Amino acid sequence: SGFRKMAFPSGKVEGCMVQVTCGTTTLNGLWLDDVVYCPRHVICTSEDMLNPNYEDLLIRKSNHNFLVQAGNVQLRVIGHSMQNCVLKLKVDTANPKTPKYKFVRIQPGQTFSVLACYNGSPSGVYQCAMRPNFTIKGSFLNGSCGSVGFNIDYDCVSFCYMHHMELPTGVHAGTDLEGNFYGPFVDRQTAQAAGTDTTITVNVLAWLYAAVINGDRWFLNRFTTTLNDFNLVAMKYNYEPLTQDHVDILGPLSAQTGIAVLDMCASLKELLQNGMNGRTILGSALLEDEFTPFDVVRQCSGVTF
Amino acid sequence: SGFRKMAFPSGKVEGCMVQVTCGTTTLNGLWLDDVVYCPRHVICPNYEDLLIRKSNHNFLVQAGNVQLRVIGHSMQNCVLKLKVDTANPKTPKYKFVRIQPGQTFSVLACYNGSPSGVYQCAMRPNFTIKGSFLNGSCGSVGFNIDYDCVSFCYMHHMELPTGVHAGTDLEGNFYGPFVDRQTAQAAGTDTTITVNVLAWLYAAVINGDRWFLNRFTTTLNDFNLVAMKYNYEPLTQDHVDILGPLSAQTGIAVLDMCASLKELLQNGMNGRTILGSALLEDEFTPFDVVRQCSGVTF
Ligand SMILES: COCCN(C)S(=O)(=O)N1Cc2ccc(Cl)cc2[C@H](C(=O)Nc2cncc3ccccc23)C1
Ligand SMILES: COCCN(C)S(=O)(=O)N1Cc2ccc(Cl)cc2[C@H](C(=O)Nc2cncc3ccccc23)C1
């Protein structure tokens, strides 16, 4: 019993964190085999950030301009290349602590663990989700750039995010490990803002199914709904549209609890209309949207209470 | 910017988790040097009588894909100490510390000696923890990290009927009036950790959430009279002193913030949130707020 925002154990990722320094800029890098991956803005000054020409800035650099530090050991850079918004620094030593890994690009609504780092040293781990507006509500200070997001289903680390910047609303933007940004963002200091965000509907439904598994049913009702009528109501509360894929994905949780997806959609509609009336659901007074159907199946018991 | 429920990096603890099997019971153990620590209920009620009937070879200890050999055993309070023939090469610098209610720690939840997740939690005033544990999680540990040293403070033993959890320090002394057996046990009435709610209100002000700030202040006695009405723990002069740094950084005196908390307790949030929450959060200590809003590393 219980339901917590749970992160993956971070050890496999901690053994990959390094410090990358270029001139006056210091940030984090991810050392996998003989390559250190880091944001390409490590080659920029603050002035350069308005309209940086990364290709022109990079051609002026040599291997020995990049200082890479792994713990108390200085790694030697023997090559460099840029792939989209990430810099790949070839080093002369392979990381002996390299785990089994993959680079995966995720979709909005997906969750992942973030190992926040400063000066190549891990400070904390937390769980978060890729928002529908492609930002993440992280906890990052100056020097956190290069910190990574990951999942560890089984013994393989799937790296899905690398931190690049903080937007004016305090939310965060970054890339996959191939250097492609999530969202319409650029690694440039522009009048750049997060679009209006929405609630991840399929995740709120998963979390309501989690509450039923843990023994709480106060929010259920005798009604059902069509998918179209649910979406017409949901969009009035800034909730993401629920697709047939989302309904299919919730199938297992529907079979375990005995509550049809469209019946759970009816309960959600009523919660949006009424509020909680002094009650909580899994210790929360708001509808939680940062647990996926997969996270609920992984954390909750296989036997409903 | 941002404020998350943040756990310590778990790697130094992951390298200590092992699986312990005795008969039909399988649970987790903590392997430090040549000793594996685990709940004594793995042998399950006279515990010394149950233990005297066991030999070293009855305990099967598995570290990854390697079977460790048990060469001795002893009991210390509610913790079983299994002497093994191999010292853990991954043993970090560590200490066993007993924490107080209100203090927070990270939990590395494990099943079959394999870490599955890490989360942050607090020792409630009623000595329980609101954790996330299923069958097989016994032996999972709670810890904090100070520089390069792991301070182990909790070992999981059981789930109470309300779904909350109970356990011991690493010397086997329970937190709370609990016993390690199947009997009528219940968590006492819980209270809110006042000094922690205040720390979280300072974290909100630091992050640019000031709507609850007001021109008023209060005495410590008047604040405590109000706080007792809402099942909040009393605020002591030690708590006021501990909040000193956050008070100097934001310019809001601790009794100035107490007047804000009193108004929130008497009138609610009125449709508003603080750091994305509609409830007053009490599982961040003043030290957690300072650490997360400064970037301390390990
Ligand atoms: C203070 O607002 C943050 C943005 N800045 C105006 S800045 O610090 O000068 N800035 C500009 C900028 C522009 C583009 C890119 Cl790709 C990166 C960056 C940097 C950036 O975003 N770094 C940070 C990342 N995460 C978290 C932070 C938290 C605090 C402070 C920097 C944080 C630096
Ligand atoms: C209905 O929940 C209580 C479960 N038990 C009644 S039990 O499974 O029979 N039970 C009895 C018991 C008595 C004393 C001690 Cl020290 C430990 C234990 C065990 C216990 O508490 N183990 C669990 C720990 N954390 C989480 C759980 C979650 C589910 C199920 C066991 C969980 C087992």
Ligand SMILES: [Cl-]
């Ligand atoms: Cl995805």
